[model samples]
Target: TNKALLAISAIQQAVLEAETSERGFLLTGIETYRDSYIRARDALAARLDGLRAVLADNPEQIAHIDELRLLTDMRMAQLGRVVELGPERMREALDILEQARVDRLTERIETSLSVLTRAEQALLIQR
Candidate 1:
């Protein structure tokens, strides 16, 4: 149960880190920010796989995990689109980030993570 909780925290951290990196890249037009975003995204992918392995038997947790995976994927896709636009089109990229609702997606992901965390804590207490 502790391991499951740790995995969940790690996944959430990765998402937050990626969001920060994405924001940095969008605001500064820095290549290193995009690199940071990629690293965070990769870490998130691995953590998600680890969490799935750890919680394979818990159907409820699995459903939460699936929702998280979907949210993360959506968030990453949005970031990737902006990153692909390159620093040369900074204004356009920023506009897309705002108009496409990336911030709302990030907020939804955070909310979903909070729900999962609460559910995990309940499981831990019940155990």
Candidate 2:
């Protein structure tokens, strides 16, 4: 009944873990933790679908998830760019200005996920 809540939590945890891996790679210029990004990227769709599966009744939440997908895609691509570029050229991948772009997308994703999580949790608690 609260699967959306669980899925959102999963997404939240995945991003945290992936970003840790990303930050480590960016700061150290090492490849050891870079693999986590790809693993996190691959898990996204399945997690989103898991949320979607239990959310078919709410158009508002559905619309939110659709919008979330675009943000999530851009967010992943930016992270991918940082890893692929390596520290040598990561300035452009995540320039001070460019890093702000990734940060905004991340914030947007979190805001939307929060909304989605509350909708389902509220429903569950109501019933």
Candidate 3:
């Protein structure tokens, strides 16, 4: 399950990278940030495959993977809307985030990841 550990950590990092890059692009209208966002997206693709492969023996982990993917889908979808505005509507992109509930949803993502990591580490927590 060492590979599982790598996948989990890298996957989380890539998710964060993608989000930050998205924000940077939306905020600065920098093409470099947009490139990095796409790079992170590409990075996440392989990490998910690795995670799923190592977790094949665990059905619950598969469910977790699906859940995580769904969360990313929602997140990326929201970010894409801002990206479409480009720098021309920077404040608009920023303003939408307030009502979009991204940070709250991001916290949910963090909790989900920590719980999964702890479970894989052989640590048990009360439900």
Candidate 4:
């Protein structure tokens, strides 16, 4: 019943977590934030996979979910490079993270809208 909302919520939470991690790194420059960023990225990736599984009966929907997964993976790789830099370059990395978060939020919103528009009650209704 909650699968659709759960999937959308997962994506939204992941975006928020990524944004928070960027802020945390910008403010603290701590490795913890970088780690948090990775966790959020991976968690979101996993959630996307779960969504794909849930939509397995619909190949077209699965393909769309896969596209989102690929985008997230690309973002994660970009984040990895940011994590490799030194403290002097931390601000640059943070800048990248911030921009990445904004991009992710935009994409997630678009995808969520697509999902919502495709079905209203179906998402929350138990199968």
Identify the candidate with maximal lDDT: 1
lDDT of 1 by residue, 1-127 (tens): 7888788889889988887898888778778998999999999999999999998998998998899899889888888887777567888888877876835887888788887788888988998
Alpha carbon lDDT at 24, candidate 3: 89
lDDT (Cα, tens digit) per residue for candidate 2, span 68-105:
87878777777777777766776764674366464688
Query: Candidate 4: minimum summed lDDT over ten consecutive residues — where?
Result: 117-126
The TM-scores of all predictions, comma-separated, are 0.90, 0.82, 0.86, 0.68
* Tens-digit lDDT string for candidate 3 (1-127): 5567767889889888988898888777779999998899888877887787877878888888878877777777776777676678867877776666845667777777776787787733332
Give me the overall lDDT of model 3.
Answer: 0.78
lDDT at 104, model 2: 87
Q: lDDT score, residue 101, model 1?
A: 87
lDDT for residue 25 in candidate 4, whole number 0-100: 66
TM-score of 3: 0.86
Query: Which residue pairs clash within candidate 3?
Result: none
Error of 3 at 46 (Å): 2.5
Candidate 2 residue 72 C-alpha distance from true site, Å: 0.9
Q: Estimate the Cα RMSD of every predicted model relative to the unseen true structure.
A: 1.6, 2.3, 3.3, 3.7
Which prediction has more favorable lDDT, 2 or 4? 2
Ranked by lDDT, the better of candidates 1 and 3 is 1
Preferred candidate (lDDT higher): 3 or 4: 3
